[PDB]
Amino acid sequence: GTYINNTEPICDVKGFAPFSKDNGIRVGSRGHIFVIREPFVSCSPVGCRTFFLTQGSLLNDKHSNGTVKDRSPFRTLMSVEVGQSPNVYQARFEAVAWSATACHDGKKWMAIGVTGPDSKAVAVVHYGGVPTDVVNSWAGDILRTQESSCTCIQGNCYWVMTDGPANRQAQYRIYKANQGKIIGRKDVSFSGGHIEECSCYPNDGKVECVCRDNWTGTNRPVLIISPDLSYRVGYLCAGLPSDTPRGEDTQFVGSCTSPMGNQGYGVKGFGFRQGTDVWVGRTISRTSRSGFEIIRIKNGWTQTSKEQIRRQVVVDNSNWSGYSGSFTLPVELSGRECLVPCFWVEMIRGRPEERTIWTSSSSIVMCGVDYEIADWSWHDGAILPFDID
Amino acid sequence: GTYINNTEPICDVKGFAPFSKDNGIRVGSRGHIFVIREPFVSCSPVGCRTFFLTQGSLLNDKHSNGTVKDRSPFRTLMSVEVGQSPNVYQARFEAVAWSATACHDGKKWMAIGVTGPDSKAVAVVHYGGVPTDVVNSWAGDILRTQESSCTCIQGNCYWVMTDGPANRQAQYRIYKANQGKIIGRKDVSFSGGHIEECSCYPNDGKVECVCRDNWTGTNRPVLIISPDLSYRVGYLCAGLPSDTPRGEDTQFVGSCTSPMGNQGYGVKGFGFRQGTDVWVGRTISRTSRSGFEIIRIKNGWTQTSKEQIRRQVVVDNSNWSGYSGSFTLPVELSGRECLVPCFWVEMIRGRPEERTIWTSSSSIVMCGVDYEIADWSWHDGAILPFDID
Amino acid sequence: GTYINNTEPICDVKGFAPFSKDNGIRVGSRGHIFVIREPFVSCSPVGCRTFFLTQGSLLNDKHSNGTVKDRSPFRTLMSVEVGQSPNVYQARFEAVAWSATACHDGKKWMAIGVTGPDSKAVAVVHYGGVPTDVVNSWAGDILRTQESSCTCIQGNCYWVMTDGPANRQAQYRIYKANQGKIIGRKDVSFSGGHIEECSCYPNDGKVECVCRDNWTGTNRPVLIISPDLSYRVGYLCAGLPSDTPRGEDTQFVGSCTSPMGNQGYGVKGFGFRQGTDVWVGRTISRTSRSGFEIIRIKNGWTQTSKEQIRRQVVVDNSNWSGYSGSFTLPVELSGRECLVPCFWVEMIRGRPEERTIWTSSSSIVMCGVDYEIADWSWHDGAILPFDID
Amino acid sequence: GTYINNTEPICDVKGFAPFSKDNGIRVGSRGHIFVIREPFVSCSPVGCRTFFLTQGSLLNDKHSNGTVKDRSPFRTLMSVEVGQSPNVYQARFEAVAWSATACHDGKKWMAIGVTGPDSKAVAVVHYGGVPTDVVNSWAGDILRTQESSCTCIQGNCYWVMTDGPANRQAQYRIYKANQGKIIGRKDVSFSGGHIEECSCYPNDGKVECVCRDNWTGTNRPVLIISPDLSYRVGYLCAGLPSDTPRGEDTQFVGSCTSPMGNQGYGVKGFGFRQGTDVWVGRTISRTSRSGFEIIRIKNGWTQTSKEQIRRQVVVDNSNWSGYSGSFTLPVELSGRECLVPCFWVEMIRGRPEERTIWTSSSSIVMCGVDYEIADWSWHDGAILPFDID
Ligand SMILES: [Ca+2]
Ligand SMILES: [Ca+2]
Ligand SMILES: [Ca+2]
Ligand SMILES: [Ca+2]
């Protein structure tokens, strides 16, 4: 007995409890902490890990100068245990990557890193610490993936990739792998729809993803993947937009099928089905990546509901946030009969918003519980500028 | 076979042998050492760990500026092995917390961290590295806990919490948990009595705690918890006060039922029943947190005894001390038939007493043995001010 | 079940996927990273490790002054997991050595370090973390070895050593060991031929090595070792030279038996048999250790072929490279039926080519896959000079 | 199966091969390395560890100022794997101690640290990471022990302690322990003889120690302990003195029963019985702690032999040495049928000999092999003064 089932329903939860906080930038003032982005969480049967992209550079060093390309040859995926800062001396090497996803099937870690050139990039699949397969760019335009946990059901692991334009129609694929080896792929037909940077989780033996529309939608697309790779694709039905930037709530009319709101740009974000309701994350500000709030919509997975019945602030609107993503706790760690829904929020510090040569981020992680949880702000807390500035 | 019984009597001991000393502040002059408070010890079947609260900041860095609130959003519970300094690169993440307790039931670590807002704070229970339950503030006034080892008997783990005023009547609860899940709670009726920051241990299959009175008592309250959660509550009978600040010994009349001494303030401290005698810890000074001595009182658990029959100095009255707390060694590590009683002393350095921007502490840990042990001073030993000062 | 068989054929592969990159020098600007050379990779059943030679000195420290002899008494072999920087606090001690090889037989690591004086040096064999045997210099002229993975087949581990002149005829031996103990040696007769710094791998139950000629050959010698230690020895047949320095390709006529090209000097490098084809590594420049390319030659293992059918650039010719070496993934990690061929490239920074007091290197590791992989440059990326300069 | 037998003869060896070298001071110029003394080696069934005494202070920090007492309250015993520098972030806490011994019985580590006051000091026995027993000073004059590996035979572990004057008659005891608990002690009658800082090893099911005479002997005492604690005591028979300081070899007449040479002072050192021969370590200089040489004396364990038949220099007489001590490799690591004899040499840097505020040391470790090994110098190699100077 070794593979995780993950065929159970997602736990229905009234609130989200603080899991961990790494304080990485604050520690980085003096300690040896990588400059990072996308601090995503994923879990095995023994514990949860925080994954992150590095530039081979440390905070308070000249190499942190953020003029370096995002898609550089120095870009690597590394990991630490959840709540550990992304420090050099505890870190584990996962992949060469400027885009990533990772997940644990119950026996080993699977990690996928995209590197190489824009026009012909390479996704290298790792399983158990070594390359086992690859996917080459199929559309020759920045092959890329979730930047969050992929999802593993019964020994088969699932993720979503995109190749094509960052601001108009692109192409989308879902992938399936067992023990490091790709055993199926499907092209997701979604004309007029855009998909990036999906936040996925298991629920009831399917994969559900809530992704980012970077073309015209201030709502988030939703992708529901069956193990045979038939999928359903559309938009989160709810009548509140959860992308950033977005328009006022009052203005918004939702749509189960179309992007709405007619604005470009975006941020990675997430949501969890709760029967027919939905929990949705978003920044507080509609115009910038500041603040973090999670909102439950009555019937918001099946209807263009604006029925808000819960709201918990996790980062206040005076503080910088960023990407967020989803994962779940396995049953063997949680001890429950359902899959506990959890999320992470990245808190971006430095350039552009602040006068620094560098940019990094830290995180606050939260897990669904059966109780209301009070509002508070678990913000980054670093004091900028730093010495190297 | 996995759960620890801890149903055995506490070892009767004539003295306390040095276990470990981390030298954390001294190392922090150059190494990457968290700024800490409450360095409590707790043990599993494989070893003992030192837990501590951090601020996400390191010694000799600007983030150590101690103007930050105690109950900040950066506050986390972390741990290292006993005698390791609270350094970043060996540390293990336990909880987001500005108040904590932890203990090991024989299979996994249970850790409890309180964070969130004063008026509606959240205790998050961790078991095996993940959230499994919570307790929300029931009195909306700084929900808080032991800052020391909780106690585990036969797979059920016990701790004490307080919600209410820091200087007058507050409310007190005891909690019981199995595998991360709360299975019972009881309100402790104690009118006119105050309870904070309890130091508890197993003895004979009950939980005994020696807590801090921050209202009127220079004596320490005592709480004795049966596994069904019926409890006995009162004050340590002995005719010597062990709180700080306190009045002269000669002045003092003890009380098995009431606080005595009629002074406010306090410090976390401890004691161990020895049949009907008691070992009690206290600072040497009656007015400040300087020095550390442990005293055995003949019949001091059952009578208002002033019969002192042993005294061992562990920190001299020229050196700063602080909180102290209790724990026990499991039988599987100790190899004995009784539960060895052990304690830790925190040694506070920096503000208020010394001219620094920061405040941290280090520790000396001691374990009961069957021999008299000579007086000495295992003091912190750091040389202040530091560079950042 | 514990010993690795490694009796399987080498995987036939169309390309090489990025495995890892440590970014060691970049991190060394601020972190505590050894000054290194020869960052070779070798793997066990549980993972792959990067081995390296240190000088007991760190980057950005006065001890990194590179006036110290290469064959100094401070020289040690240490290791980290693949893709971890050669940092002090994750490193594992392997041997005292200014020349090395290491490999894992399926039960334990075998490590061999040469130290001591030029005229009578000592190779100390380590197995399972302790000395188990030695080989003393047999020719009293810088006893030395592969600086890469040795090769283990069925519990017996194989390596090649050289004792004698660095620029003319020297003497060569192959060694065989089980559980740390030498069980056979053979002198390799190779008059007029030179062998240094062999890069070997298992294939079909023999050991094949592609070594460096430092006397007259711009082609590489090839050594094929049977388990009874009979061997075949000659030169890589192919009509393209893969040493550096070398002459133009157009000029070159290959030879299965003789060194060709009539130039001295050299660099450690590698190649893999693919049935009758060969993959060969080389620097891009013919005159300096800049760039890295891998080329497949149709029939290049059996014929003086110039039939190039694949070429993948891994480091561009604007960036410094260095030594390269080979290893293979075990079947138990890879999950395949063949031995996946992998290599590493060292990227040298600092003196001579650059104005620094020091010299170190970092690495990019690559593994054979069943797909073409696009050209790119995974270069070191450090920004020199450093502070200590 | 868990306890080590260690009832086998000591391997007869013709030379000593380099095991490891930590380079600790050199790394300490930039890394976070404890200021140490007595870097002794001891081994379990899984590997060998280097133990060391720290002051809670790091190299290049103001706390390294060596005005601090040797017997301070900050003094702790810590350990790392053999060949790792004594760095903070890999170190393991063993005991509070300004004098120590440690050894592994096959199941757990036993560690013994002496701390507390000169006139009534406490040895705390640790087994499996916790206190299990103590020995209080019996003569009220600096209770102290080997500063090297103790010796474990069949689950019973043996060490030697001294209480009394450092320069004239003192009292000596041998101790026996199983699973952390003292099960026997014996007073060693040795009138006119002095014993300090014994270097012991198992051989043929007894414990043999070669100790330091700090009173009148430039020869070393020898102690042979049977498992029932009857002992034989005398001096190493050989006609060459191995203490430092000592008189010329030519002058010396050995003695199996008496100290000879009539000089005070001393240094910890070692020797190994080889049937009736002896290997003996000593500094090269007769007047200072410089150089290291090992010499085999024909019949030197049973006769006042001056028959020198082997000599291997390990540190040259231009370089600082210091204490040395003995240990053995277990059969389960070594794979042999005899106990391999190994030793360590400490290389002292800084005050007194050099102009520094601090004093620390590094080490070179060596293990017996069946071959002559060439002369060389594996010296410390640090470049003093350091910055803090
Ligand atoms: Ca959008
Ligand atoms: Ca009080
Ligand atoms: Ca050549
Ligand atoms: Ca002497």
Short mmCIF file of N, CA and C in Angstrom, two decimals, chain A residues 268-307:
data_model
loop_
_atom_site.label_atom_id
_atom_site.label_comp_id
_atom_site.label_asym_id
_atom_site.label_seq_id
_atom_site.Cartn_x
_atom_site.Cartn_y
_atom_site.Cartn_z
N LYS A 268 -2.60 34.69 -11.07
CA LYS A 268 -2.93 33.33 -10.67
C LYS A 268 -3.78 33.37 -9.40
N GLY A 269 -4.80 32.54 -9.35
CA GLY A 269 -5.70 32.51 -8.20
C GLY A 269 -6.37 31.17 -8.18
N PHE A 270 -7.38 31.02 -7.33
CA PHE A 270 -7.93 29.70 -7.02
C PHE A 270 -9.38 29.74 -6.57
N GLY A 271 -9.95 28.56 -6.46
CA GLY A 271 -11.28 28.42 -5.84
C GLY A 271 -11.54 26.98 -5.52
N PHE A 272 -12.49 26.71 -4.61
CA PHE A 272 -12.88 25.34 -4.29
C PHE A 272 -14.39 25.13 -4.37
N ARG A 273 -14.81 24.18 -5.19
CA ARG A 273 -16.18 23.72 -5.11
C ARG A 273 -16.56 23.20 -3.70
N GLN A 274 -17.73 23.62 -3.22
CA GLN A 274 -18.32 23.15 -1.98
C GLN A 274 -19.75 22.67 -2.28
N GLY A 275 -19.92 21.42 -2.69
CA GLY A 275 -21.17 20.99 -3.27
C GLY A 275 -21.47 21.84 -4.48
N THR A 276 -22.40 22.80 -4.32
CA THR A 276 -22.78 23.75 -5.40
C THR A 276 -22.32 25.20 -5.10
N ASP A 277 -21.87 25.44 -3.87
CA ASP A 277 -21.29 26.72 -3.52
C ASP A 277 -19.84 26.77 -4.03
N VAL A 278 -19.17 27.91 -3.83
CA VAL A 278 -17.76 28.02 -4.15
C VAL A 278 -17.06 28.93 -3.16
N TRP A 279 -15.84 28.56 -2.76
CA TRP A 279 -14.97 29.49 -2.08
C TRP A 279 -14.09 30.05 -3.15
N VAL A 280 -13.93 31.37 -3.15
CA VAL A 280 -13.09 32.01 -4.12
C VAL A 280 -12.14 32.96 -3.43
N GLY A 281 -10.87 32.91 -3.85
CA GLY A 281 -9.85 33.86 -3.41
C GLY A 281 -9.74 35.06 -4.36
N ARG A 282 -9.39 36.22 -3.81
CA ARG A 282 -9.04 37.39 -4.65
C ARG A 282 -8.30 38.43 -3.84
N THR A 283 -7.56 39.27 -4.56
CA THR A 283 -6.94 40.44 -3.92
C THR A 283 -8.07 41.40 -3.51
N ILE A 284 -7.81 42.30 -2.56
CA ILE A 284 -8.88 43.16 -2.06
C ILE A 284 -9.13 44.28 -3.06
N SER A 285 -8.07 45.03 -3.33
CA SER A 285 -8.01 45.96 -4.43
C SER A 285 -8.45 45.29 -5.72
N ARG A 286 -9.11 46.06 -6.58
CA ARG A 286 -9.54 45.55 -7.86
C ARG A 286 -8.49 45.86 -8.91
N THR A 287 -7.55 46.75 -8.60
CA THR A 287 -6.59 47.29 -9.58
C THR A 287 -5.15 46.84 -9.36
N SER A 288 -4.83 46.41 -8.15
CA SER A 288 -3.49 45.96 -7.86
C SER A 288 -3.49 44.72 -6.99
N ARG A 289 -2.31 44.13 -6.88
CA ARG A 289 -2.10 42.88 -6.16
C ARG A 289 -1.85 43.14 -4.68
N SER A 290 -2.84 43.73 -4.05
CA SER A 290 -2.76 44.11 -2.67
C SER A 290 -3.94 43.42 -1.97
N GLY A 291 -3.74 42.99 -0.73
CA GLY A 291 -4.79 42.39 0.06
C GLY A 291 -5.07 40.95 -0.35
N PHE A 292 -5.68 40.20 0.56
CA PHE A 292 -6.25 38.90 0.26
C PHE A 292 -7.46 38.55 1.11
N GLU A 293 -8.51 38.12 0.40
CA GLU A 293 -9.78 37.77 0.95
C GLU A 293 -10.24 36.48 0.30
N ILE A 294 -10.90 35.66 1.11
CA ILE A 294 -11.60 34.51 0.57
C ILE A 294 -13.12 34.62 0.82
N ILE A 295 -13.92 34.38 -0.24
CA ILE A 295 -15.37 34.53 -0.22
C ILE A 295 -16.10 33.22 -0.64
N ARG A 296 -17.06 32.78 0.16
CA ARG A 296 -17.93 31.68 -0.23
C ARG A 296 -19.19 32.21 -0.90
N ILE A 297 -19.49 31.68 -2.09
CA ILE A 297 -20.69 32.08 -2.80
C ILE A 297 -21.70 30.94 -2.71
N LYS A 298 -22.88 31.24 -2.18
CA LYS A 298 -23.99 30.29 -2.21
C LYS A 298 -24.29 29.95 -3.67
N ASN A 299 -24.19 28.66 -4.01
CA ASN A 299 -24.52 28.17 -5.33
C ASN A 299 -23.61 28.70 -6.46
N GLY A 300 -22.45 29.24 -6.09
CA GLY A 300 -21.59 29.93 -7.04
C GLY A 300 -20.83 29.05 -8.04
N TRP A 301 -20.85 27.73 -7.84
CA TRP A 301 -20.28 26.79 -8.80
C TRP A 301 -21.30 26.42 -9.91
N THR A 302 -22.60 26.55 -9.62
CA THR A 302 -23.63 26.11 -10.58
C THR A 302 -24.51 27.25 -11.15
N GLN A 303 -24.37 28.47 -10.63
CA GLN A 303 -25.28 29.56 -10.94
C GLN A 303 -24.53 30.85 -10.87
N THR A 304 -25.10 31.89 -11.47
CA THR A 304 -24.43 33.15 -11.56
C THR A 304 -24.78 33.86 -10.27
N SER A 305 -24.48 33.20 -9.16
CA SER A 305 -24.86 33.70 -7.84
C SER A 305 -23.98 34.89 -7.41
N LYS A 306 -24.61 35.82 -6.69
CA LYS A 306 -23.91 36.87 -5.97
C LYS A 306 -24.21 36.70 -4.50
N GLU A 307 -24.76 35.55 -4.12
CA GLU A 307 -25.08 35.30 -2.73
C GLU A 307 -23.79 34.98 -1.94
#
